[PDB]
Design a protein around this ligand. Sequence first.
Ligand SMILES: Nc1ncnc2c1ncn2[C@@H]1O[C@H](COP(=O)(O)OP(=O)(O)NP(=O)(O)O)[C@@H](O)[C@H]1O
Ligand SMILES: [Mg+2]
Length: 551
Amino acid sequence: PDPAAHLPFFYGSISRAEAEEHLKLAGMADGLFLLRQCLRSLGGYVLSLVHDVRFHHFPIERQLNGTYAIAGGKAHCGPAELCEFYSRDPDGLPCNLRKPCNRPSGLEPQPGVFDCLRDAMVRDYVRQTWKLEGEALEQAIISQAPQVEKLIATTAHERMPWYHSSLTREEAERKLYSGAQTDGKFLLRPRKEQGTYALSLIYGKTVYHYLISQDKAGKYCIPEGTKFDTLWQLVEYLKLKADGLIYCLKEACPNSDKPRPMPMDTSVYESPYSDPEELKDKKLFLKRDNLLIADIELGCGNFGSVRQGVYRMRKKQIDVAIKVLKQGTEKADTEEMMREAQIMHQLDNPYIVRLIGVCQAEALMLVMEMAGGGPLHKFLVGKREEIPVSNVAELLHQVSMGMKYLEEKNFVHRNLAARNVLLVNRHYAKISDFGLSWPLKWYAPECINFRKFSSRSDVWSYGVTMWEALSYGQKPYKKMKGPEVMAFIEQGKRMECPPECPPELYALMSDCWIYKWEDRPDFLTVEQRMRACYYSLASKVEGGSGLEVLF
Ligand SMILES: Nc1ncnc2c1ncn2[C@@H]1O[C@H](COP(=O)(O)OP(=O)(O)NP(=O)(O)O)[C@@H](O)[C@H]1O
Ligand SMILES: [Mg+2]
């Protein structure tokens, strides 16, 4: 995720002529400006502007600690910031930024090599760290991209299999001719000159050596000149672009609680039935003998009582959460519940609480995954200082991804609220209580008005859920109740934009509250939109208390 991908004046990987072109068409007015990618430095941009009808191009280097600055200028926490600052203070520039050269309608930034490099490295960090695949992997990427990128830049080259901490030119030469003499086979070693390294590669059965040089900035360099923040990136980039090399890198000559928790560090990120064998025998109805129901309760709600337990599986014992439906069948509606549970037993997403199965004994029991973190709204109460706006944006994201999935499968969650989003940890939220057939504050009108439950109705309560989240647990439509809102709503009257909730996110939960359920968007759009916002927030520096902040 590029931090400057939301800014409508950012054009991605384009040349100078292209930039200068767009700038013509827009007037040439003094203070007109755009931002684009820098082709020869990883993470950098180029600030281009028009002063006295002449173009000015300012390279913006991405420093090591994450800050961005024009050479010899002030450092910023990011592009957005950088461009707001120079809008009200030229500070060295010819004039102050004035009119963004907003991108024309329908265009989006043009993907560059670094983008592919970034998205690719990400995909492989996860793939290898958590041996994840299928949507499982697609889903851990979408939500955790931002965090991975940060882990990537902190991953020491010493750790990599292609780095050899104490080889000399000849030793290097020696080793390489020792194994398979394929083209592209390579290693990297530390030079005498501190902060210098060598890239030894095999081509046409000959070892070639390239010097890697570091900056006063601390960046890393191919004598070709392209600049990277770490060796791993450099190396990973040279398997793609052969610039300045006899040949590109291929195979690697081989070598010999956490601060910030991730969603896939958990046991519940992936379905219990993903062990092929465990999957083979996936009964909707569970035996009561393989169930251990604790006497003490996790909580209690309108629907029933929730008790922690543990379930015996073919090869493992899993922590489960049991909900005891307060209400049983009455009439052979029993199956109809069965019919449903059958549909829920299918839904598989890392961001929803999964149905392990059901079990009937003393009571009808809903056996589900263990998200013992307690619900969203409570978790956020009075934690405005402790839990940054980005970390909330991240949990709202995960919820969107769950509803996205649920939408996909033509499944309506009807009881969507903060109270129905349960944290596994501070960065991992799961949606729950989806098929359970004042709590009418979340319901879009047409549910109340016509009992019409669509995913478009869910889209409403999401906007409601967003409000609760972005205002740290505060009740919604406090000052009201029942028809009080029904009327309050009928008249284009909406909830307020909680303090310090960005414009985009409000404008979002707002579109969620468009009376005509048709004119309202679908989750596909929401998660899409929710993503950009989240991403721009996360790519920055991190707020809050704890120990994950020291990292
Ligand atoms: N799978 C679970 N894992 C751990 N705790 C849970 C789980 N499901 C529910 N709980 C607990 O029970 C509380 C919520 O009660 P629940 O029975 O889910 O109904 P509710 O959110 O209060 N209202 P409603 O779903 O609208 O009837 C939460 O605060 C949780 O602590
Ligand atoms: Mg609940």
